[PDB]
């Protein structure tokens, strides 16, 4: 059996739930941590099912973990360690945000508290980021191809060619995004990704550049499903991902389905 499967068999209602099956505790990380600006670690409390993978969450330009705080309890309650981080300076570029995403992951593995390290599987790490943090999410996978999953949220980046990414990448675009429009950012990012890569592009209807900053069930249900399928190798969640989701909130979806288990 898959030793990384956590939680009961998933329903369409379960992935959408505000509170997952797990109970969430937290740990505050000082900004004097090396490589990044600290953050808040959300981790499951139940330990009788085994350790969990982790996901580091980066904010956008001039932003902090407050704009990404709702991902913590929402995602960690489904069986993940969520590390919403702050950057060194709020004006950090996408390239710098990719390094600090990895520096946060290193902290989880090397210097985190015993209560977090004892619950952590350091071989199953993922990244996620909003806007310039989304560009940093793409940057991190280029810097560390061993990551399990990557979720750029309405990402922004100068470079458009990502044809050497080897990490399963889920790009969420906003239809009415005029800061990082999907026509010149999110879609060119997805298309430049290797055709052989397990990837997906979800465009939210009527959403703006700042939609990932507020509780959104369409984002949460498939962020959870993407993390389950590639961080936990939980094929029980391939149902919600392949074939392409048909939610009313979604305006366009592209994928390399099916995601054959490797
Ligand atoms: Ca620091």
**Contact call for residues 134 and 155 (beta carbons, < 8 A):** yes
Task: Please list the residues that pair with 128 across neighbouring strands.
Answer: 57, 151
The Cα–Cα gap between 133 and 112 comes to 22
Sequence-ordered strand ranges (E) for the chain: 24-29, 39-44, 52-58, 81-85, 120-130, 149-153, 169-174, 199-204, 250-255
Total count of residues recorded for the chain: 262
CA of 113 to the centre of ligand 1 (A): 17
Residue 176, C-beta contacts closer than 8 angstroms, at least 6 positions apart: 206, 207, 208
Full residue range of the structural domain in which residue 143 is found? 1-262
Task: Please list the residues that pair with 42 across neighbouring strands.
Answer: 26, 82
CA of 86 to the centre of ligand 1 (A): 9
DSSP symbols for 94-119: HHHHHHHHHHHHHHHHHTS-HHHHTT
CA of 37 to the centre of ligand 1 (A): 4
Sign of CA dihedral 154, 158, 163, 164: negative
> Alpha helix (H) ranges present in the chain?
12-16, 70-76, 94-110, 114-117, 132-143, 186-192, 217-231, 238-241
Structure solved using which method? X-ray
Query: Resolution (in Å) of the shown entry?
Result: 2.2
CA of 209 to the centre of ligand 1 (A): 27
Q: How many CB atoms lie within 10 A of CB 169?
A: 28
Cα radius of gyration rounded to whole Å, the chain: 16
Domain count, the chain: 1
**Contact call for residues 210 and 180 (beta carbons, < 8 A):** no
**Contact call for residues 131 and 155 (beta carbons, < 8 A):** yes
CA of 104 to the centre of ligand 1 (A): 10
Q: How many CB atoms lie within 10 A of CB 6?
A: 22
Tokens of residue 133, six digits: 């943090």
């Amino acid at each position: 059996p898959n030793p990384y499967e956590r939680g009961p068999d998933p329903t369409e209602d379960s992935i959408e739930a505000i509170r997952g099956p797990f109970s969430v505790a937290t740990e505050r990380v000082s900004s004097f941590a090396s490589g990044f600006g600290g953050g808040t670690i959300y981790y499951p409390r139940e330990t009788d099912e085994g350790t969990f993978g982790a996901v580091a969450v980066a904010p956008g330009f001039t932003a902090s973990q407050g704009s990404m705080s709702w991902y913590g309890e929402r995602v960690a309650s489904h069986g993940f360690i969520v590390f919403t981080i702050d950057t060194n300076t709020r004006l950090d570029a996408p390239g710098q945000r990719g390094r600090q995403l990895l520096a946060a992951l290193d902290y989880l593995v090397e210097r985190s508290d015993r209560k977090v390290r004892e619950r952590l599987d350091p071989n199953r790490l993922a990244v996620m980021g909003h806007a310039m943090g989304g560009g940093g999410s793409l940057e991190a996978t280029v810097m560390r191809p061993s990551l399990k999953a990557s979720i750029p949220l309405t990402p922004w980046h100068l470079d458009k060619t990502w044809g050497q990414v080897q990490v399963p990448t889920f790009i969420i675009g906003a239809e009415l995004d005029t800061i990082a429009p999907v026509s010149t950012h999110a879609k060119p990012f997805y298309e430049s990704l290797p055709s052989s890569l397990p990837k997906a592009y979800m465009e939210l209807c009527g959403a703006t550049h700042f939609a990932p900053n507020i509780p959104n069930t369409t984002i949460a249900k498939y962020v959870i499903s993407w993390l389950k399928r590639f961080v936990d190798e939980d094929t029980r969640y391939s149902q919600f991902l392949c074939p392409n989701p048909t939610d009313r909130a979604i305006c366009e979806y592209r994928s390399t389905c099916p995601y054959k288990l490797n």
